[PDB]
Design a protein around this nucleic acid. Structure first.
Ligand SMILES: C[C@H]1O[C@H](O[C@H]2CC[C@H](n3ccc(NC(=O)c4ccc(NC(=O)[C@@](C)(N)CO)cc4)nc3=O)O[C@@H]2C)[C@H](O)[C@@H](O)[C@@H]1N(C)C
Ligand SMILES: NC(=[NH2+])NCCC[C@H](N)C(=O)O
Ligand SMILES: [Mg+2]
Ligand SMILES: [Mg+2]
Ligand SMILES: [Mg+2]
Ligand SMILES: [Mg+2]
Ligand SMILES: [Mg+2]
Ligand SMILES: [Mg+2]
Ligand SMILES: [Mg+2]
Ligand SMILES: [Mg+2]
Ligand SMILES: [Mg+2]
Ligand SMILES: [Mg+2]
Ligand SMILES: [Mg+2]
Ligand SMILES: [Mg+2]
Ligand SMILES: [Mg+2]
Ligand SMILES: [Mg+2]
Ligand SMILES: [Mg+2]
Ligand SMILES: [Mg+2]
Ligand SMILES: [Mg+2]
Ligand SMILES: [Mg+2]
Ligand SMILES: [Mg+2]
Ligand SMILES: [Mg+2]
Ligand SMILES: [Mg+2]
Ligand SMILES: [Mg+2]
Ligand SMILES: [Mg+2]
Ligand SMILES: [Mg+2]
Ligand SMILES: [Mg+2]
Ligand SMILES: [Mg+2]
Ligand SMILES: [Mg+2]
Ligand SMILES: [Mg+2]
Ligand SMILES: [Mg+2]
Ligand SMILES: [Mg+2]
Ligand SMILES: [Mg+2]
Ligand SMILES: [Mg+2]
Ligand SMILES: [Mg+2]
Ligand SMILES: [Mg+2]
Ligand SMILES: [Mg+2]
Ligand SMILES: [Mg+2]
Ligand SMILES: [Mg+2]
Ligand SMILES: [Mg+2]
Ligand SMILES: [Mg+2]
Ligand SMILES: [Mg+2]
Ligand SMILES: [Mg+2]
Ligand SMILES: [Mg+2]
Ligand SMILES: [Mg+2]
Ligand SMILES: [Mg+2]
Ligand SMILES: [Mg+2]
Ligand SMILES: [Mg+2]
Ligand SMILES: [Mg+2]
Ligand SMILES: [Mg+2]
Ligand SMILES: [Mg+2]
Ligand SMILES: [Mg+2]
Ligand SMILES: [Mg+2]
Ligand SMILES: [Mg+2]
Ligand SMILES: [Mg+2]
Ligand SMILES: [Mg+2]
Ligand SMILES: [Mg+2]
Ligand SMILES: [Mg+2]
Ligand SMILES: [Mg+2]
Ligand SMILES: [Mg+2]
Ligand SMILES: [Mg+2]
Ligand SMILES: [Mg+2]
Ligand SMILES: [Mg+2]
Ligand SMILES: [Mg+2]
Ligand SMILES: [Mg+2]
Ligand SMILES: [Mg+2]
Ligand SMILES: [Mg+2]
Ligand SMILES: [Mg+2]
Ligand SMILES: [Mg+2]
Ligand SMILES: [Mg+2]
Ligand SMILES: [Mg+2]
Ligand SMILES: [Mg+2]
Ligand SMILES: [Mg+2]
Ligand SMILES: [Mg+2]
Ligand SMILES: [Mg+2]
Ligand SMILES: [Mg+2]
Ligand SMILES: [Mg+2]
Ligand SMILES: [Mg+2]
Ligand SMILES: [Mg+2]
Ligand SMILES: [Mg+2]
Ligand SMILES: [Mg+2]
Ligand SMILES: [Mg+2]
Ligand SMILES: [Mg+2]
Ligand SMILES: [Mg+2]
Ligand SMILES: [Mg+2]
Ligand SMILES: [Mg+2]
Ligand SMILES: [Mg+2]
Ligand SMILES: [Mg+2]
Ligand SMILES: [Mg+2]
Ligand SMILES: [Mg+2]
Ligand SMILES: [Mg+2]
Ligand SMILES: [Mg+2]
Ligand SMILES: [Mg+2]
Ligand SMILES: [Mg+2]
Ligand SMILES: [Mg+2]
Ligand SMILES: [Mg+2]
Ligand SMILES: [Mg+2]
Ligand SMILES: [Mg+2]
Ligand SMILES: [Mg+2]
Ligand SMILES: [Mg+2]
Ligand SMILES: [Mg+2]
Ligand SMILES: [Mg+2]
Ligand SMILES: [Mg+2]
Ligand SMILES: [Mg+2]
Ligand SMILES: [Mg+2]
Ligand SMILES: [Mg+2]
Ligand SMILES: [Mg+2]
Ligand SMILES: [Mg+2]
Ligand SMILES: [Mg+2]
Ligand SMILES: [Mg+2]
Ligand SMILES: [Mg+2]
Ligand SMILES: [Mg+2]
Ligand SMILES: [Mg+2]
Ligand SMILES: [Mg+2]
Ligand SMILES: [Mg+2]
Ligand SMILES: [Mg+2]
Ligand SMILES: [Mg+2]
Ligand SMILES: [Mg+2]
Ligand SMILES: [Mg+2]
Ligand SMILES: [Mg+2]
Ligand SMILES: [Mg+2]
Ligand SMILES: [Mg+2]
Ligand SMILES: [Mg+2]
Ligand SMILES: [Mg+2]
Ligand SMILES: [Mg+2]
Ligand SMILES: [Mg+2]
Ligand SMILES: [Mg+2]
Ligand SMILES: [Mg+2]
Ligand SMILES: [Mg+2]
Ligand SMILES: [Mg+2]
Ligand SMILES: [Mg+2]
Ligand SMILES: [Mg+2]
Ligand SMILES: [Mg+2]
Ligand SMILES: [Mg+2]
Ligand SMILES: [Mg+2]
Ligand SMILES: [Mg+2]
Ligand SMILES: [Mg+2]
Ligand SMILES: [Mg+2]
Ligand SMILES: [Mg+2]
Ligand SMILES: [Mg+2]
Ligand SMILES: [Mg+2]
Ligand SMILES: [Mg+2]
Ligand SMILES: [Mg+2]
Ligand SMILES: [Mg+2]
Ligand SMILES: [Mg+2]
Ligand SMILES: [Mg+2]
Ligand SMILES: [Mg+2]
Ligand SMILES: [Mg+2]
Ligand SMILES: [Mg+2]
Ligand SMILES: [Mg+2]
Ligand SMILES: [Mg+2]
Ligand SMILES: [Mg+2]
Ligand SMILES: [Mg+2]
Ligand SMILES: [Mg+2]
Ligand SMILES: [Mg+2]
Ligand SMILES: [Mg+2]
Ligand SMILES: [Mg+2]
Ligand SMILES: [Mg+2]
Ligand SMILES: [Mg+2]
Ligand SMILES: [Mg+2]
Ligand SMILES: [Mg+2]
Ligand SMILES: [Mg+2]
Ligand SMILES: [Mg+2]
Ligand SMILES: [Mg+2]
Ligand SMILES: [Mg+2]
Ligand SMILES: [Mg+2]
Ligand SMILES: [Mg+2]
Ligand SMILES: [Mg+2]
Ligand SMILES: [Mg+2]
Ligand SMILES: [Mg+2]
Ligand SMILES: [Mg+2]
Ligand SMILES: [Mg+2]
Ligand SMILES: [Mg+2]
Ligand SMILES: [Mg+2]
Ligand SMILES: [Mg+2]
Ligand SMILES: [Mg+2]
Ligand SMILES: [Mg+2]
Ligand SMILES: [Mg+2]
Lengths: 203, 77, 110, 59, 141
RNA sequence: UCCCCCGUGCCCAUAGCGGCGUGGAACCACCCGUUCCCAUUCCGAACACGGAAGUGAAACGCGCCAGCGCCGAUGGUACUGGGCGGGCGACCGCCUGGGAGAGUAGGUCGGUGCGGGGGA
RNA sequence: UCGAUCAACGGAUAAAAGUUACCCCGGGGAUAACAGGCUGAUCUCCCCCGAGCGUCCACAGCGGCGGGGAGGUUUGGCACCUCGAUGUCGGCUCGUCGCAUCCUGGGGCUGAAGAAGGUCCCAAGGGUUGGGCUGUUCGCCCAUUAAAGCGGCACGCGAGCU
RNA sequence: UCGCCUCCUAAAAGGUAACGGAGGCGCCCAAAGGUCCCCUCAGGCGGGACGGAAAUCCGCCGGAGAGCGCAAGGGUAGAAG
RNA sequence: GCUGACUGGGGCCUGUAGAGCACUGAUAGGGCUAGGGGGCCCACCAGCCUACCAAACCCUGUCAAACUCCGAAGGGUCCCAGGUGGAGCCUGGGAGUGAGGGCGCGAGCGAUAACGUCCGCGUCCGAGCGCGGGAACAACCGAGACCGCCAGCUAAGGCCCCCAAGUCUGGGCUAAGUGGUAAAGGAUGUGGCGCCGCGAAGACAGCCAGGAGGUUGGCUUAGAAGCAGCCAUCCUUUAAAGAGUGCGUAAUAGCUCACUGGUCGAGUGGCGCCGCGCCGAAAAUGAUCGGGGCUUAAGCCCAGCGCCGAAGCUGCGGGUCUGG
């Protein structure tokens, strides 16, 4: 889809306070411009949880602008698991590479058998025209068995969308479950103590 | 119990002994190295132990020629 | 990936320059043989000599001397006496050789 | 311009080098004020001890 | 329980546990996960303890990912002995863990099944844990 | 002072792998021979001598394409010299100066010195 | 130019191993054995988690694999006062304190019918036998008991005895 | 265990301890020295009598991962091979 | 005789922190795919399927003192300049020291123990056991004591009383004497900030009723009747109502949840972040935060004015040494 969000510029302000002022430092940047922005961390949160790096977001800049863009990158406070910076990509009418989501429709056979669907990729990288952004990409996963797998090759691509990866890429798989029965045997598991790489005249 | 390591060698004082823009005479040492981490540029020699040493009373100078290595020169006066 | 032609060219020449003397470069084509004396510290050439630009005949060997004798002739005028002989990827033999034999006659010292 | 430097905290307990700065400037006592030209060199040490000194721009 | 299969050097030093997680702070595979709020040397004994706890709360099913591995050799002298006389012998391996790192993930299972099992897997850890969900923040990584 | 070529240096891949196309008047290369100088741990492939019927297929040169490789900001974070704080600890934070790496947007199928041959 | 496991490799002699509870002297708490001290790996007791047992039922009684603490009675680590001396096991005598309570008292739960038990909680006032073996602490055993508790005081107590 | 060498610890000059973690020397070469000329490896794919996962030959790819008598290090094909 | 520590500019050397995976090795999962284990099918030599142990290779995600495609802050040294200091260079005489210790940061060893040990930069005590603060204490905070004063200003630390100066001013938090020693963990403790539902299409509490038949349902077993594991979520009457939330049971049943009819008439039930507090919390001569004692504090956080407070600074006088 396409959401919206106010974005205001910055410069001499210092990211320390901002993010304590409740605002998330950020930058707008394509091949033509490059400006430093900042957003009400809360407001943008309510969007990115819905948008991610998938759906379009036009910034309602205070100058009067209102540019279409996508998020190329989000930097997070590893310790506190929180965002500390964002990159909005000035989306122009040119062909672009972006991650398009995936919705795996159909209940795989393995699931019915006890396996699990390891949704390896949850979105796909693709070149496209922003005007031609799909919402999402269906994929049938009904005929999957433990432990069959699925690739970008087996994707059925809509118009104007073109993979930006090697079809040999994998994007899903049905794998066996966690089974207690495997435990007890795993307990009496004997593992020969680690071998140390010989050195010197011992090779 | 007991150990089987506990042995080592006397550090050799390796490195550079005269830096760029530094004034030397004929015969001084410019780099003490293992291998040819540097190379003999101009007015500079190298001995059987990759030891670089000035060849005239000049002024030291380095030069990073990329893939070709890092050379030490001696422009006279 | 270099070629035995490329390599042999370097080692013969990287060694020469270590003497810091003027370098007599010789090129050997199927038809003509050329020769320019170079100064690899100023990156510039001085006196040139080639069969081609000398309207020279057939005997490649006898030619080499005339380009040799000639090159030395124009050199000494510019006060160029000593010099180093670059045989490049070419072994000191015949054309390449005979040339140097001429230059040595013209006055050049090597 | 010129700088008036006053030694307000004791170097007793800071590295030998900083004690040398107070020497460079000329500060050998507490509260001691010393007015100095405003070159970069002077303005260098003076900054090395600004956790010990109170600075003021004069004339 | 985990440990390498082959090693260059028998004994590592001790390093340190200063700073936030170098990497692994973000859900990569499974749906939910277990994050580290404070550092430690987490022992394969510990890991296996979490693991088995979750696999058994899943009874049959589920999928557990272990995003930390005990590759640090943990050494200790014999018993009652003196100081010196070489370095201690190895007695098990540990997994260095620093705050914000995702130690375990899970998939193919409800919500009040991963939440629980993770809570139980968290009580087998010498540190504090934080149960997390997959955020688009994760996906943009 | 301009464009094509043979030589030879410089920066040291923004210059390379690869795919395509193009050049033979000149020069360059494959070329025609192995009598002669010279030569293969066998081979005139290589080096080398004498040639000048042919071809630019191979190699080299000059140009387009971003699949790989290389290069790569801005903003932010990690870390940090110096100066202060917190916790019993593992450890955690603030101020002043410095400030990465990975990643993003992008850039790149080279630039220039000298002397030769031809051309306008 | 040669003769070097002068390898204890700056190499006392050309030439050399042991024992001392018969021992001596000069020095050291610069250095061990006792004890104390800092630490708390080991030791003692307490807890988090709740897989699994208990016909049924996780938690009456139990607690896999793991996690976090307290205490300073064990074995040790360090080697901090003491080697111009701080005498070290056990016992006898005499106590006194702690409470993680052996007994008596008061409670909850109980797979508590009752009687009698089990398990946590409150409580340190008083009590907690006599013997056989052994130097023994401890432990085993006989006869009993309301019960025959564990520990600190330099493993309390030799200018108080042995 | 005791001298010598290599790497780390060593906190981005040198130097830096511990009965700290890992390995080596007490030789060797008459060529494995000097100089001139020439040559370039492992490795992957396909190809071939005996003939093989690796004997040697042919082809393409292959900036160096082979090699340098020996431990390790740095260095190194534009050579030190 | 200005060359000194320290400082400003500039050039060169480096490979740590941090990080990265291109080399060396380690690494969980998946993909691709030589090589075996095992099932059919075979001795005729070849085929086929694998929820099986797995090489190389790619992908997502990591690890390393003895790994580095990268790579700091700093450090080191050379030149110019500042720097006149119990600074430096040189020659010469006399020594003592060659048993260090605490602290801080970086490591190793140790158990991510020790008033432990062994190195590195620094600092202090040593020699400042002279002074102020820290209840008391060589090394933590402050500060380098020539001597004298019944003078003044300050540092750390402090201002209710012991005990010099505020029972000072403003806002907030705490009810535990937390303050005035400890962790996992546990809890409707209290306060501030947010989020999802449900609610006058009348909620939550309570009230009132209902809550129903196939159906004591099936793989199912020895009890398995909604509530001991699965490979299960199908119909009916309907106002509504899981073939079921839980309690309950040996297994029947009852109890209520989700569920709608009635009753009142406004909010309620469940998450997560921060602040301060509770339990968790057992040791031995007599108790205590240094004491008394303190609760819109005499405690904690944030913001201010003023004072007390050293052998530091000033002020007056004096001594000696060195320089002018
Ligand atoms: C009988 C003799 O008695 C007397 O001499 C004795 C006096 C004592 C001395 N001794 C004795 C013992 C010892 N230590 C150890 O055994 C030891 C034990 C354990 C550990 N444990 C650890 O390290 C742990 C814990 N970390 C674990 O690893 C370390 C060291 N050290 C000694 O010095 O021995 C002498 C000869 C007479 O004078 C003599 O006439 C007579 N006879 C010669 C006629
Ligand atoms: N400028 C500096 N060197 N700062 C060091 C700060 C170190 C401090 N522990 C921190 O993490 O922030
Ligand atoms: Mg969209
Ligand atoms: Mg938020
Ligand atoms: Mg040994
Ligand atoms: Mg050693
Ligand atoms: Mg050593
Ligand atoms: Mg050493
Ligand atoms: Mg060394
Ligand atoms: Mg150097
Ligand atoms: Mg030499
Ligand atoms: Mg040599
Ligand atoms: Mg330069
Ligand atoms: Mg020069
Ligand atoms: Mg040039
Ligand atoms: Mg001070
Ligand atoms: Mg101080
Ligand atoms: Mg400095
Ligand atoms: Mg003073
Ligand atoms: Mg001041
Ligand atoms: Mg590390
Ligand atoms: Mg541990
Ligand atoms: Mg150890
Ligand atoms: Mg040791
Ligand atoms: Mg262990
Ligand atoms: Mg980690
Ligand atoms: Mg825990
Ligand atoms: Mg990443
Ligand atoms: Mg063509
Ligand atoms: Mg072409
Ligand atoms: Mg033609
Ligand atoms: Mg003839
Ligand atoms: Mg031929
Ligand atoms: Mg040829
Ligand atoms: Mg011809
Ligand atoms: Mg062509
Ligand atoms: Mg060629
Ligand atoms: Mg060219
Ligand atoms: Mg282009
Ligand atoms: Mg980059
Ligand atoms: Mg930047
Ligand atoms: Mg600092
Ligand atoms: Mg502190
Ligand atoms: Mg920080
Ligand atoms: Mg800055
Ligand atoms: Mg960068
Ligand atoms: Mg290119
Ligand atoms: Mg021209
Ligand atoms: Mg002799
Ligand atoms: Mg030996
Ligand atoms: Mg000796
Ligand atoms: Mg001897
Ligand atoms: Mg020596
Ligand atoms: Mg002798
Ligand atoms: Mg002897
Ligand atoms: Mg005797
Ligand atoms: Mg005897
Ligand atoms: Mg006797
Ligand atoms: Mg006698
Ligand atoms: Mg006798
Ligand atoms: Mg006697
Ligand atoms: Mg004796
Ligand atoms: Mg005596
Ligand atoms: Mg001693
Ligand atoms: Mg002593
Ligand atoms: Mg002793
Ligand atoms: Mg003792
Ligand atoms: Mg004892
Ligand atoms: Mg005693
Ligand atoms: Mg003792
Ligand atoms: Mg005592
Ligand atoms: Mg004592
Ligand atoms: Mg103690
Ligand atoms: Mg303790
Ligand atoms: Mg407890
Ligand atoms: Mg049972
Ligand atoms: Mg029960
Ligand atoms: Mg329990
Ligand atoms: Mg247990
Ligand atoms: Mg523990
Ligand atoms: Mg003890
Ligand atoms: Mg002692
Ligand atoms: Mg004494
Ligand atoms: Mg004594
Ligand atoms: Mg006495
Ligand atoms: Mg005495
Ligand atoms: Mg009690
Ligand atoms: Mg009782
Ligand atoms: Mg009772
Ligand atoms: Mg009964
Ligand atoms: Mg009964
Ligand atoms: Mg009873
Ligand atoms: Mg009872
Ligand atoms: Mg009592
Ligand atoms: Mg009693
Ligand atoms: Mg008795
Ligand atoms: Mg008797
Ligand atoms: Mg006994
Ligand atoms: Mg017995
Ligand atoms: Mg009785
Ligand atoms: Mg009783
Ligand atoms: Mg004892
Ligand atoms: Mg004892
Ligand atoms: Mg005693
Ligand atoms: Mg006694
Ligand atoms: Mg006696
Ligand atoms: Mg006695
Ligand atoms: Mg070093
Ligand atoms: Mg260093
Ligand atoms: Mg030196
Ligand atoms: Mg030793
Ligand atoms: Mg050895
Ligand atoms: Mg050799
Ligand atoms: Mg064959
Ligand atoms: Mg090699
Ligand atoms: Mg070897
Ligand atoms: Mg290297
Ligand atoms: Mg001067
Ligand atoms: Mg100087
Ligand atoms: Mg200087
Ligand atoms: Mg210095
Ligand atoms: Mg400087
Ligand atoms: Mg690191
Ligand atoms: Mg790697
Ligand atoms: Mg990667
Ligand atoms: Mg690392
Ligand atoms: Mg290292
Ligand atoms: Mg490293
Ligand atoms: Mg770079
Ligand atoms: Mg630098
Ligand atoms: Mg100056
Ligand atoms: Mg003077
Ligand atoms: Mg002095
Ligand atoms: Mg002095
Ligand atoms: Mg003297
Ligand atoms: Mg000594
Ligand atoms: Mg000592
Ligand atoms: Mg002494
Ligand atoms: Mg000493
Ligand atoms: Mg020391
Ligand atoms: Mg010490
Ligand atoms: Mg002390
Ligand atoms: Mg310390
Ligand atoms: Mg600090
Ligand atoms: Mg530190
Ligand atoms: Mg440290
Ligand atoms: Mg170390
Ligand atoms: Mg350790
Ligand atoms: Mg310590
Ligand atoms: Mg000591
Ligand atoms: Mg020492
Ligand atoms: Mg002394
Ligand atoms: Mg002091
Ligand atoms: Mg002092
Ligand atoms: Mg003091
Ligand atoms: Mg005193
Ligand atoms: Mg005294
Ligand atoms: Mg004091
Ligand atoms: Mg005091
Ligand atoms: Mg006082
Ligand atoms: Mg002072
Ligand atoms: Mg005042
Ligand atoms: Mg007070
Ligand atoms: Mg009083
Ligand atoms: Mg008040
Ligand atoms: Mg107030
Ligand atoms: Mg209480
Ligand atoms: Mg209290
Ligand atoms: Mg908690
Ligand atoms: Mg808590
Ligand atoms: Mg609560
Ligand atoms: Mg209620
Ligand atoms: Mg059923
Ligand atoms: Mg408590
Ligand atoms: Mg008491
Ligand atoms: Mg004074
Ligand atoms: Mg006066
Ligand atoms: Mg004086």
């Amino acid at each position: 889809m396409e959401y919206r969000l106010k974005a205001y510029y910055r410069e001499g302000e210092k990211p320390s306070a901002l993010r304590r002022a409740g605002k998330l430092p950020g930058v707008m940047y394509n091949r033509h411009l490059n400006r430093k922005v900042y957003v009400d961390l809360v407001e943008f949160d309510k969007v990115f949880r819905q948008a991610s790096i998938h759906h379009v977001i036009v910034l309602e800049l205070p100058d009067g602008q209102s540019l279409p863009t996508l998020v190329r990158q989000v930097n997070l406070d590893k310790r506190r698991r929180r965002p500390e910076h964002v990159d909005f990509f000035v989306l122009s009418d040119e062909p672009v590479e972006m991650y398009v989501p995936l919705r795996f429709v159909g209940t795989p056979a393995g699931v019915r058998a006890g396996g699990v669907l390891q949704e390896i990729h949850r979105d796909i990288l693709v070149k496209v025209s922003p005007r031609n952004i799909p919402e999402f990409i269906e994929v049938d996963v009904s005929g999957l068995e433990i432990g069959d797998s699925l690739h970008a090759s087996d994707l059925k691509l809509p118009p104007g969308v073109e993979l930006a990866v090697s079809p040999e890429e994998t994007i899903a798989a049905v794998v066996p479950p966690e089974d207690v029965e495997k435990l007890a045997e795993e307990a009496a598991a004997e593992v020969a103590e680690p071998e140390v790489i010989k050195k010197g005249k011992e090779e | 119990g007991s150990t089987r390591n506990g042995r080592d060698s006397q550090a050799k004082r390796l490195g550079v002994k005269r830096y760029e823009g530094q004034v030397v005479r004929a015969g001084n040492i410019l780099v003490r190295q293992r291998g040819t981490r540097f190379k003999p540029g101009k007015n500079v020699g190298m001995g059987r132990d990759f030891t670089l040493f000035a060849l005239v009373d000049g002024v030291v100078e380095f030069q990073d020629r990329g893939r070709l290595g890092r050379y030490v020169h001696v422009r006279p006066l | 990936r270099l070629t035995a032609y490329e390599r042999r060219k370097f080692r013969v020449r990287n060694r020469i320059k270590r003497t810091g003397r003027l370098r007599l470069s010789v090129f050997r084509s199927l038809k003509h043989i050329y020769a320019q004396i170079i100064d690899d510290e100023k990156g510039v050439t001085l006196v040139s000599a080639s069969s081609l630009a000398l309207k020279l005949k057939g005997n490649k060997t006898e030619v080499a001397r005339q380009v040799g004798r000639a090159l030395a002739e124009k050199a000494l005028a510019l006060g160029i006496k000593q010099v180093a002989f670059d045989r490049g990827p070419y072994k000191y033999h015949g054309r390449v050789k005979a040339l140097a034999e001429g230059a040595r006659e013209g006055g050049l010292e090597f | 311009p010129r700088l008036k430097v006053k030694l307000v905290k004791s170097p007793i307990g800071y590295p030998k080098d900083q004690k040398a700065a107070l020497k460079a400037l000329g500060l050998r006592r507490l509260q001691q004020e010393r007015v100095l030209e405003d070159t970069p060199a002077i303005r260098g040490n003076v900054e090395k001890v600004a956790h010990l000194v109170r600075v003021e721009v004069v004339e | 329980m985990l440990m390498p299969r082959r090693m260059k050097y028998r004994k590592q030093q001790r390093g340190r546990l200063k700073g936030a997680t170098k990497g692994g702070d973000y859900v990569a595979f499974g749906d939910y996960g277990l994050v580290a709020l404070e550092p430690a040397w987490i022992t394969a004994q510990q890991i296996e303890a979490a693991r088995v706890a979750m696999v058994r709360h899943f009874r049959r099913g589920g999928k557990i990912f272990i995003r930390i591995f005990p590759d640090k050799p943990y050494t200790k002298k014999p018993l009652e002995v003196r100081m010196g006389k070489g370095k201690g012998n190895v007695e098990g391996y540990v997994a260095v863990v620093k705050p914000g790192r995702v130690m375990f993930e899970v998939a193919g299972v409800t919500e009040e099944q991963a939440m629980e099992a993770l809570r139980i897997a968290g009580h087998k850890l010498p540190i504090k844990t934080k149960i997390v969900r997959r955020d688009a923040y994760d996906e943009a990584q």
